[PDB]
C-alpha cells in the first residue's frame, strides 16, 4: 500500500536578481507529499519557506528543477492552481464586497460552474461558522476570517493545500484551534497539506517537517 | 461579473455618483443634438471627449484600488480572460445605466420643451448618442483596465 | 550610577475592534529601557510583539496606560518620532526616486534643517556602505537596503531605536551581520534599542528580553 | 519639495507627458482667446474645465501610487503641513512649466500668424490664461491630494 505522490518537487531552485548581484532564494529543494499528510516547513525567517510554498503553489516558476502535481500534467500554472490547489493565505485575503458564503461561491464561479450554495454552507459549518454565511467581512473576527479562508480553500475539492503561517495574527487559543482544524480537514478530505510555520507549539500537529536553512531543504521525521 | 456586480452593490454611493455624472452629460448631448437638428458639432465632439476622459479617470482609479482583490483572484486561479470580462462588464453596465437614464430623461424633456424653442426629437437623435457615448466609454475602459491582466499574484502572499 | 530611563511603558494596553467583538492586542505591558541597551522582544507570532513596538514608537496610542519618552514630554506623537526616534522597519522602506545618500538626507530635510551630506556619507560608511552614497535603490541588495535603513535611523541622532525583525528576508550570514551592526551602533551611539525577533540565533546579541504571550509582556534577563 | 523634485527627475517620462498635455491645452486656449479678441467664450470655459479635470485625474492617480512613500514619511515623522506642501509644490511646478511653455510658444505662433488671420496678441491675453489655468489646476490639485494628510503610518510597519 504505497500511494502515488500528490506533489513532487525535485532539485528546484529559485534565483532572483538582488540589486546588481543575485540571491539564491531556494537551493535544490526536494519534497514529496501524499494524500492525508500535513508536512510542516520550518526554519528561521529568510531561509526560503515562503519561496518553497510559492513554487509548490505554481505562483512562481523555478529557475531550475521541477515541480510536478500528479494529475495536473499538461496544465499551465494558473489552471493548475484553479483546478487542483487551495490557498490558506497568511492574510485572510477576503474580498470586502462579498459575504462569507460568497467568498466560497466565487471560487465556484471562476472555476466555470454554477455556484453550489448548499456546499458553501456545509463547508462554513465544517470550519466552525455554521450559519454565518451572510456575515460581511467587517463582521468577522480575525479567527473567523481565517476559518472562512480555509473553507474557501476547501470549496474546490483540491488535492493540494498550502497554508502560509495562517495563525501569525492570532493568540495561543485561536492558533491551536486553527492548526487543529487544518490537521482535521487534511485527514478528513485526504489533502496533501504543506504548512509553513515558525511556532514550535504547532509542530506536534505535523506528520513530518522540511527543515529550511539558507534555501536548502531537508525532509525530516523529527 | 460576479465580483463586479457585488462591487456595484456594496459601494453603491460612488457608482451612483459616477452614473449620475455620465447620465447628466449624455442628457446634455441629447439636448444639444436635438437643438442642433460648425460650433454646435464642435461642442458635441468635445463633450464626447470629456465623457470619455471622465470614464478613463474614474476607471483607472477604481482598478488601481481593486489591485489586491484582483491579485487574490489571480492567485486562486482566475484567468486573464475572466478578470478582463469582469472589469469590462462592470464598466459597461455602469455606462449603460448612465446613458440610458440620461437619454430617456432627455427625450422626455425634449418632448416637453418642443413648444418654446425648436426641438427636433427623433429616435436616432437619442440612440446614436446613447450607444456612441457607451462605446466611447468602453474604449476608454479598455484603455483603463489594460493592466488588470498584469497584476502579480504573489502580492496575495504578502502581509 | 543609575541612569534615567529613555523609554517607560507602564501598564499599556491596546484594545482593537475585531469584527463585532474586540481583541486585546496588548495587555498591561511594562518595559523600561536605558541608554546603550539592546532589549529583544520575543514570542510566537500573534503575541503582540509588533504592537508593543508600535506603541513604543508613537505610531499608535495605547487605549489605556502610558508610554513616556523621557526628553519628549510636551510633544505630540508625530514630533516625538521626528525628533527622538529611529525606525529600522522590517521592510527597508526606501524611497525609489532617492539615492542611498538621499534616503539619509531627506530625514534632515523633514526635520527642518539643511541636509548634512558629510554626515550622511560618514553614516553610510559606518553601516558598511562606504562610497555607495550615489547608488539607486534598484542597485542595492536586500542586505545593503537594510544597512541603508539603519543609517537612515541613525541620521537624526535618536535616543530610541526600534528594529522590527529587520533580518526576516535575509540568510544566516547577512542576518548575523545585521544584528551585529545593530548591537554595535546601539553601544557606540548609546541608543536604547527595542528589537523584535523570532529567531533564537539572535538572542545572544541582546542584553535582556521581553517575553510576549497573548499580549502579556514579561521583562526577563534570560 | 525635496521628494517632489526628485520624483520629477526619476520619473521624467510621465511628468513630461502630462506637462506636454497641459502646455498644449494652454496654447490652445491662448490661440482661442487671441482669435476671440458667446460660442468662443463657452468653448474657452469648457476647455479650462477640461484642463482642470485632466489635472485632477492625473494627480489622484499619482498620489494613490505614492501612498506607501507618503506612509513611510509620516511614520518617520513628517508633518501634514510638510507632506501637503510637497504634493502641492510638485503639482504647481509641473503646471507652471506646462502653462509657461504653452503660452510662450502660443504667443510666438500668434506673432507669426497675425498676418493671415486677424490675431490680437496682448500681454493680458497670454498671462491671464496662463495664471488662470495654473490656479485652475492648483485648486484641482488640492481636491486631488486632499487625503495625503490621511495616510496611516502603520502601513509602513507591514510587509
Amino acid at each position: 500500500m504505497s500511494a502515488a505522490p500528490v506533489l513532487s518537487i525535485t532539485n528546484a531552485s529559485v534565483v532572483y536578481p538582488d540589486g546588481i548581484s543575485t540571491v539564491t532564494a531556494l537551493d535544490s529543494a526536494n519534497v514529496e507529499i501524499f494524500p492525508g499528510e500535513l508536512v510542516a516547513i520550518v526554519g528561521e525567517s529568510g531561509s526560503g519557506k515562503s519561496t518553497l510554498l510559492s513554487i509548490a503553489g505554481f505562483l512562481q516558476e523555478p529557475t531550475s528543477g521541477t515541480v510536478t502535481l500528479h494529475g495536473a500534467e499538461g496544465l499551465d500554472a494558473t489552471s493548475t492552481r484553479r483546478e487542483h490547489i487551495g490557498f490558506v493565505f497568511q492574510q485572510p485575503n477576503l474580498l470586502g464586497s462579498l459575504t462569507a458564503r460568497e467568498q466560497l461561491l466565487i471560487t465556484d464561479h471562476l472555476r466555470g460552474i454554477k455556484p453550489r450554495k448548499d456546499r458553501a454552507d456545509e463547508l462554513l459549518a465544517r470550519v466552525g461558522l455554521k450559519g454565518l454565511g451572510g456575515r460581511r467581512v467587517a463582521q468577522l473576527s480575525g479567527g473567523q476570517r481565517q476559518r472562512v479562508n480555509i473553507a474557501r480553500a476547501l470549496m474546490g475539492n483540491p488535492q493540494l493545500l498550502l497554508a502560509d503561517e495562517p495563525t501569525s495574527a492570532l493568540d495561543a487559543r485561536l492558533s491551536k484551534e486553527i492548526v487543529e482544524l487544518l490537521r482535521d480537514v487534511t485527514k478528513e478530505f485526504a489533502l496533501a497539506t504543506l504548512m509553513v510555520t515558525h511556532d514550535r507549539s504547532q509542530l506536534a500537529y505535523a506528520d513530518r517537517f522540511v527543515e529550511m536553512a539558507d534555501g536548502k531543504a531537508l525532509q525530516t521525521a523529527k | 461579473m460576479f465580483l463586479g456586480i457585488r462591487d456595484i452593490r456594496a459601494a453603491a454611493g460612488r457608482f451612483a455618483l459616477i452614473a449620475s455624472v455620465v447620465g447628466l452629460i449624455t442628457l446634455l448631448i441629447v439636448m444639444l443634438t436635438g437643438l442642433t437638428q460648425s460650433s454646435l458639432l464642435s461642442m458635441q465632439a468635445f463633450l464626447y471627449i470629456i465623457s470619455a476622459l471622465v470614464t478613463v479617470a474614474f476607471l483607472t482609479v477604481w482598478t488601481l484600488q481593486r489591485t489586491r482583490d484582483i491579485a487574490v483572484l489571480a492567485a486562486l486561479g482566475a484567468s486573464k480572460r475572466y478578470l478582463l470580462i469582469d472589469a469590462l462588464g462592470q464598466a459597461a453596465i455602469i455606462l449603460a445605466a448612465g446613458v440610458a437614464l440620461g437619454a430617456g430623461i432627455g427625450a422626455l424633456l425634449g418632448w416637453l420643451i418642443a413648444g418654446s424653442v425648436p426641438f427636433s426629437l427623433g429616435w436616432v437623435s437619442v440612440l446614436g448618442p446613447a450607444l456612441g457615448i457607451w462605446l466611447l466609454g468602453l474604449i476608454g475602459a479598455t484603455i483603463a483596465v489594460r493592466n488588470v491582466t498584469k497584476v502579480d499574484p504573489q502580492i496575495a502572499l504578502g502581509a
Side-chain angles (χ1 to χ4, degrees), chain A residues 3 7-8 12-14 17 23 38 46 55 65 82 86 95 125 136 148 166 176 189 199 206 216 218 221:
Chain A
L7 186 72
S8 298
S13 287
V14 174
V23 51
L38 196 171
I55 69 155
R82 186 211 311 122
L95 307 185
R136 283 282 220 98
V148 171
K176 195 167 88 57
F189 288 97
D199 302 322
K216 277 175 304 291
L218 179 57

PDB file of all heavy atoms in Angstrom, chain A residues 3 7-8 12-14 17 23 38 46 55 65 82 86 95 125 136 148 166 176 189 199 206 216 218 221:
ATOM      1  N   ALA A   3       0.887   4.781  -1.839  1.00  0.00           N
ATOM      2  CA  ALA A   3       0.183   5.715  -2.705  1.00  0.00           C
ATOM      3  C   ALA A   3       1.162   6.483  -3.586  1.00  0.00           C
ATOM      4  O   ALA A   3       2.343   6.638  -3.264  1.00  0.00           O
ATOM      5  CB  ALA A   3      -0.641   6.697  -1.869  1.00  0.00           C
ATOM      6  N   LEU A   7       2.374  15.720  -4.701  1.00  0.00           N
ATOM      7  CA  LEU A   7       3.273  16.772  -5.161  1.00  0.00           C
ATOM      8  C   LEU A   7       4.714  16.298  -5.070  1.00  0.00           C
ATOM      9  O   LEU A   7       5.116  15.729  -4.052  1.00  0.00           O
ATOM     10  CB  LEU A   7       3.088  18.054  -4.341  1.00  0.00           C
ATOM     11  CG  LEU A   7       3.883  19.267  -4.819  1.00  0.00           C
ATOM     12  CD1 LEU A   7       3.298  19.796  -6.116  1.00  0.00           C
ATOM     13  CD2 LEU A   7       3.887  20.351  -3.758  1.00  0.00           C
ATOM     14  N   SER A   8       5.486  16.539  -6.133  1.00  0.00           N
ATOM     15  CA  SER A   8       6.899  16.176  -6.198  1.00  0.00           C
ATOM     16  C   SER A   8       7.703  17.388  -6.645  1.00  0.00           C
ATOM     17  O   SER A   8       7.548  17.854  -7.775  1.00  0.00           O
ATOM     18  CB  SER A   8       7.128  15.003  -7.158  1.00  0.00           C
ATOM     19  OG  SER A   8       6.451  13.842  -6.716  1.00  0.00           O
ATOM     20  N   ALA A  12      14.510  21.724  -7.103  1.00  0.00           N
ATOM     21  CA  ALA A  12      14.056  23.026  -7.570  1.00  0.00           C
ATOM     22  C   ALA A  12      14.850  24.154  -6.916  1.00  0.00           C
ATOM     23  O   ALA A  12      15.190  24.106  -5.730  1.00  0.00           O
ATOM     24  CB  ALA A  12      12.567  23.213  -7.283  1.00  0.00           C
ATOM     25  N   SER A  13      15.129  25.193  -7.710  1.00  0.00           N
ATOM     26  CA  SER A  13      15.903  26.333  -7.246  1.00  0.00           C
ATOM     27  C   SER A  13      15.288  27.618  -7.775  1.00  0.00           C
ATOM     28  O   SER A  13      14.830  27.668  -8.919  1.00  0.00           O
ATOM     29  CB  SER A  13      17.372  26.240  -7.682  1.00  0.00           C
ATOM     30  OG  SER A  13      18.046  25.258  -6.925  1.00  0.00           O
ATOM     31  N   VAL A  14      15.267  28.644  -6.927  1.00  0.00           N
ATOM     32  CA  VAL A  14      14.794  29.968  -7.303  1.00  0.00           C
ATOM     33  C   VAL A  14      15.953  30.931  -7.099  1.00  0.00           C
ATOM     34  O   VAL A  14      16.406  31.123  -5.960  1.00  0.00           O
ATOM     35  CB  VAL A  14      13.560  30.397  -6.495  1.00  0.00           C
ATOM     36  CG1 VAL A  14      13.191  31.837  -6.821  1.00  0.00           C
ATOM     37  CG2 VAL A  14      12.392  29.482  -6.804  1.00  0.00           C
ATOM     38  N   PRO A  17      17.337  38.257  -9.045  1.00  0.00           N
ATOM     39  CA  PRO A  17      18.277  39.387  -9.047  1.00  0.00           C
ATOM     40  C   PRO A  17      18.143  40.172  -7.749  1.00  0.00           C
ATOM     41  O   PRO A  17      17.053  40.624  -7.392  1.00  0.00           O
ATOM     42  CB  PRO A  17      17.840  40.210 -10.264  1.00  0.00           C
ATOM     43  CG  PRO A  17      16.385  39.913 -10.406  1.00  0.00           C
ATOM     44  CD  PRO A  17      16.207  38.475  -9.966  1.00  0.00           C
ATOM     45  N   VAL A  23      20.562  36.521  -5.633  1.00  0.00           N
ATOM     46  CA  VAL A  23      20.321  35.788  -4.398  1.00  0.00           C
ATOM     47  C   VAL A  23      19.641  34.479  -4.750  1.00  0.00           C
ATOM     48  O   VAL A  23      18.719  34.451  -5.570  1.00  0.00           O
ATOM     49  CB  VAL A  23      19.475  36.616  -3.402  1.00  0.00           C
ATOM     50  CG1 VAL A  23      18.223  37.158  -4.090  1.00  0.00           C
ATOM     51  CG2 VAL A  23      19.101  35.785  -2.178  1.00  0.00           C
ATOM     52  N   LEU A  38       0.119  16.148   6.603  1.00  0.00           N
ATOM     53  CA  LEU A  38       0.389  17.544   6.942  1.00  0.00           C
ATOM     54  C   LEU A  38       1.894  17.640   7.157  1.00  0.00           C
ATOM     55  O   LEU A  38       2.410  17.192   8.186  1.00  0.00           O
ATOM     56  CB  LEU A  38      -0.385  17.989   8.183  1.00  0.00           C
ATOM     57  CG  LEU A  38      -0.536  19.489   8.487  1.00  0.00           C
ATOM     58  CD1 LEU A  38      -1.512  19.690   9.639  1.00  0.00           C
ATOM     59  CD2 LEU A  38       0.786  20.178   8.810  1.00  0.00           C
ATOM     60  N   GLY A  46      13.723  34.094   6.521  1.00  0.00           N
ATOM     61  CA  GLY A  46      14.706  34.293   5.473  1.00  0.00           C
ATOM     62  C   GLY A  46      15.438  33.049   5.020  1.00  0.00           C
ATOM     63  O   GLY A  46      16.509  33.166   4.418  1.00  0.00           O
ATOM     64  N   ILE A  55       6.553  28.079  -4.996  1.00  0.00           N
ATOM     65  CA  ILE A  55       6.749  27.206  -6.153  1.00  0.00           C
ATOM     66  C   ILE A  55       5.873  25.964  -6.044  1.00  0.00           C
ATOM     67  O   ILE A  55       5.431  25.423  -7.066  1.00  0.00           O
ATOM     68  CB  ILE A  55       8.225  26.821  -6.362  1.00  0.00           C
ATOM     69  CG1 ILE A  55       8.729  25.883  -5.257  1.00  0.00           C
ATOM     70  CG2 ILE A  55       9.082  28.070  -6.519  1.00  0.00           C
ATOM     71  CD1 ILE A  55       9.885  25.013  -5.683  1.00  0.00           C
ATOM     72  N   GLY A  65      15.046  22.964 -12.062  1.00  0.00           N
ATOM     73  CA  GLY A  65      14.398  21.920 -11.286  1.00  0.00           C
ATOM     74  C   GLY A  65      12.917  21.814 -11.599  1.00  0.00           C
ATOM     75  O   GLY A  65      12.366  22.536 -12.438  1.00  0.00           O
ATOM     76  N   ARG A  82      -6.086  26.751 -10.272  1.00  0.00           N
ATOM     77  CA  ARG A  82      -7.539  26.858 -10.359  1.00  0.00           C
ATOM     78  C   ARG A  82      -8.243  25.512 -10.264  1.00  0.00           C
ATOM     79  O   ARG A  82      -9.404  25.459  -9.842  1.00  0.00           O
ATOM     80  CB  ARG A  82      -7.931  27.544 -11.670  1.00  0.00           C
ATOM     81  CG  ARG A  82      -9.420  27.833 -11.810  1.00  0.00           C
ATOM     82  CD  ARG A  82      -9.886  27.787 -13.252  1.00  0.00           C
ATOM     83  NE  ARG A  82      -9.029  28.562 -14.142  1.00  0.00           N
ATOM     84  CZ  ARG A  82      -8.405  28.056 -15.202  1.00  0.00           C
ATOM     85  NH1 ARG A  82      -8.554  26.777 -15.514  1.00  0.00           N
ATOM     86  NH2 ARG A  82      -7.643  28.831 -15.963  1.00  0.00           N
ATOM     87  N   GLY A  86      -5.539  24.617  -3.152  1.00  0.00           N
ATOM     88  CA  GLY A  86      -6.198  25.528  -2.224  1.00  0.00           C
ATOM     89  C   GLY A  86      -5.167  26.326  -1.449  1.00  0.00           C
ATOM     90  O   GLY A  86      -4.108  25.798  -1.087  1.00  0.00           O
ATOM     91  N   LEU A  95     -12.595  39.187   0.123  1.00  0.00           N
ATOM     92  CA  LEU A  95     -13.000  40.295  -0.728  1.00  0.00           C
ATOM     93  C   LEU A  95     -14.146  41.041  -0.054  1.00  0.00           C
ATOM     94  O   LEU A  95     -15.185  40.446   0.254  1.00  0.00           O
ATOM     95  CB  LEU A  95     -13.389  39.777  -2.110  1.00  0.00           C
ATOM     96  CG  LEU A  95     -12.282  38.908  -2.720  1.00  0.00           C
ATOM     97  CD1 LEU A  95     -12.624  38.488  -4.148  1.00  0.00           C
ATOM     98  CD2 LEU A  95     -10.914  39.597  -2.648  1.00  0.00           C
ATOM     99  N   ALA A 125     -20.083  25.566   7.899  1.00  0.00           N
ATOM    100  CA  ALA A 125     -20.376  24.813   9.113  1.00  0.00           C
ATOM    101  C   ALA A 125     -19.186  23.959   9.516  1.00  0.00           C
ATOM    102  O   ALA A 125     -18.893  23.805  10.708  1.00  0.00           O
ATOM    103  CB  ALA A 125     -21.612  23.939   8.902  1.00  0.00           C
ATOM    104  N   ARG A 136     -20.931  39.946   6.632  1.00  0.00           N
ATOM    105  CA  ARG A 136     -19.961  40.702   5.857  1.00  0.00           C
ATOM    106  C   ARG A 136     -18.590  40.624   6.524  1.00  0.00           C
ATOM    107  O   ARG A 136     -18.466  40.296   7.707  1.00  0.00           O
ATOM    108  CB  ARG A 136     -20.401  42.160   5.709  1.00  0.00           C
ATOM    109  CG  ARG A 136     -21.497  42.396   4.674  1.00  0.00           C
ATOM    110  CD  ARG A 136     -20.946  42.399   3.254  1.00  0.00           C
ATOM    111  NE  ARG A 136     -21.565  43.435   2.427  1.00  0.00           N
ATOM    112  CZ  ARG A 136     -21.020  44.625   2.194  1.00  0.00           C
ATOM    113  NH1 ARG A 136     -19.842  44.924   2.722  1.00  0.00           N
ATOM    114  NH2 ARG A 136     -21.646  45.512   1.434  1.00  0.00           N
ATOM    115  N   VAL A 148     -12.921  31.201   7.353  1.00  0.00           N
ATOM    116  CA  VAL A 148     -13.513  31.381   6.026  1.00  0.00           C
ATOM    117  C   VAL A 148     -12.478  31.106   4.944  1.00  0.00           C
ATOM    118  O   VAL A 148     -12.773  30.472   3.924  1.00  0.00           O
ATOM    119  CB  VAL A 148     -14.099  32.796   5.878  1.00  0.00           C
ATOM    120  CG1 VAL A 148     -14.513  33.047   4.436  1.00  0.00           C
ATOM    121  CG2 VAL A 148     -15.280  32.994   6.796  1.00  0.00           C
ATOM    122  N   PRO A 166      -0.847  30.617   8.764  1.00  0.00           N
ATOM    123  CA  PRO A 166      -2.192  31.197   8.875  1.00  0.00           C
ATOM    124  C   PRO A 166      -2.609  31.572  10.288  1.00  0.00           C
ATOM    125  O   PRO A 166      -3.742  32.024  10.477  1.00  0.00           O
ATOM    126  CB  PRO A 166      -3.085  30.081   8.326  1.00  0.00           C
ATOM    127  CG  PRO A 166      -2.369  28.840   8.705  1.00  0.00           C
ATOM    128  CD  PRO A 166      -0.894  29.148   8.655  1.00  0.00           C
ATOM    129  N   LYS A 176      -4.171  27.390  18.228  1.00  0.00           N
ATOM    130  CA  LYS A 176      -4.373  25.959  18.440  1.00  0.00           C
ATOM    131  C   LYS A 176      -5.627  25.468  17.726  1.00  0.00           C
ATOM    132  O   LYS A 176      -5.609  24.411  17.084  1.00  0.00           O
ATOM    133  CB  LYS A 176      -4.452  25.650  19.932  1.00  0.00           C
ATOM    134  CG  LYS A 176      -4.306  24.176  20.242  1.00  0.00           C
ATOM    135  CD  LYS A 176      -4.063  23.950  21.720  1.00  0.00           C
ATOM    136  CE  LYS A 176      -5.371  23.835  22.478  1.00  0.00           C
ATOM    137  NZ  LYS A 176      -6.208  22.741  21.915  1.00  0.00           N
ATOM    138  N   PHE A 189     -10.417  15.126   4.361  1.00  0.00           N
ATOM    139  CA  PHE A 189     -10.546  15.266   2.917  1.00  0.00           C
ATOM    140  C   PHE A 189      -9.363  14.691   2.149  1.00  0.00           C
ATOM    141  O   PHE A 189      -9.299  14.865   0.925  1.00  0.00           O
ATOM    142  CB  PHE A 189     -10.745  16.742   2.563  1.00  0.00           C
ATOM    143  CG  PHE A 189     -12.101  17.267   2.936  1.00  0.00           C
ATOM    144  CD1 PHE A 189     -12.293  17.957   4.129  1.00  0.00           C
ATOM    145  CD2 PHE A 189     -13.185  17.061   2.094  1.00  0.00           C
ATOM    146  CE1 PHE A 189     -13.538  18.439   4.485  1.00  0.00           C
ATOM    147  CE2 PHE A 189     -14.439  17.538   2.437  1.00  0.00           C
ATOM    148  CZ  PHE A 189     -14.618  18.233   3.640  1.00  0.00           C
ATOM    149  N   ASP A 199       6.230  28.717  14.658  1.00  0.00           N
ATOM    150  CA  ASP A 199       5.883  28.490  16.053  1.00  0.00           C
ATOM    151  C   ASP A 199       5.975  27.000  16.354  1.00  0.00           C
ATOM    152  O   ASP A 199       5.241  26.197  15.770  1.00  0.00           O
ATOM    153  CB  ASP A 199       4.483  29.020  16.354  1.00  0.00           C
ATOM    154  CG  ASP A 199       4.349  30.498  16.052  1.00  0.00           C
ATOM    155  OD1 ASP A 199       5.325  31.239  16.307  1.00  0.00           O
ATOM    156  OD2 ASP A 199       3.283  30.909  15.542  1.00  0.00           O
ATOM    157  N   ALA A 206       1.993  18.023  13.079  1.00  0.00           N
ATOM    158  CA  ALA A 206       2.559  17.631  11.799  1.00  0.00           C
ATOM    159  C   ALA A 206       2.920  16.151  11.802  1.00  0.00           C
ATOM    160  O   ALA A 206       3.249  15.574  12.842  1.00  0.00           O
ATOM    161  CB  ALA A 206       3.807  18.461  11.489  1.00  0.00           C
ATOM    162  N   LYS A 216      18.177  25.763   1.545  1.00  0.00           N
ATOM    163  CA  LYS A 216      18.334  24.317   1.453  1.00  0.00           C
ATOM    164  C   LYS A 216      17.245  23.640   2.268  1.00  0.00           C
ATOM    165  O   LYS A 216      16.966  24.050   3.399  1.00  0.00           O
ATOM    166  CB  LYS A 216      19.711  23.873   1.944  1.00  0.00           C
ATOM    167  CG  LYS A 216      20.808  23.989   0.895  1.00  0.00           C
ATOM    168  CD  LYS A 216      22.178  23.663   1.477  1.00  0.00           C
ATOM    169  CE  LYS A 216      22.504  24.552   2.685  1.00  0.00           C
ATOM    170  NZ  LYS A 216      22.727  25.979   2.269  1.00  0.00           N
ATOM    171  N   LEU A 218      15.594  20.026   3.903  1.00  0.00           N
ATOM    172  CA  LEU A 218      15.851  18.660   4.352  1.00  0.00           C
ATOM    173  C   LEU A 218      14.567  18.066   4.910  1.00  0.00           C
ATOM    174  O   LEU A 218      13.988  18.616   5.850  1.00  0.00           O
ATOM    175  CB  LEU A 218      16.965  18.609   5.403  1.00  0.00           C
ATOM    176  CG  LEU A 218      17.234  17.190   5.910  1.00  0.00           C
ATOM    177  CD1 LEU A 218      17.572  16.275   4.745  1.00  0.00           C
ATOM    178  CD2 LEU A 218      18.349  17.171   6.942  1.00  0.00           C
ATOM    179  N   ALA A 221      11.691  13.479   9.774  1.00  0.00           N
ATOM    180  CA  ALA A 221      10.589  12.918  10.542  1.00  0.00           C
ATOM    181  C   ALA A 221      10.561  13.415  11.980  1.00  0.00           C
ATOM    182  O   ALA A 221       9.574  13.177  12.687  1.00  0.00           O
ATOM    183  CB  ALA A 221      10.660  11.385  10.536  1.00  0.00           C
TER     184      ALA A 221
END
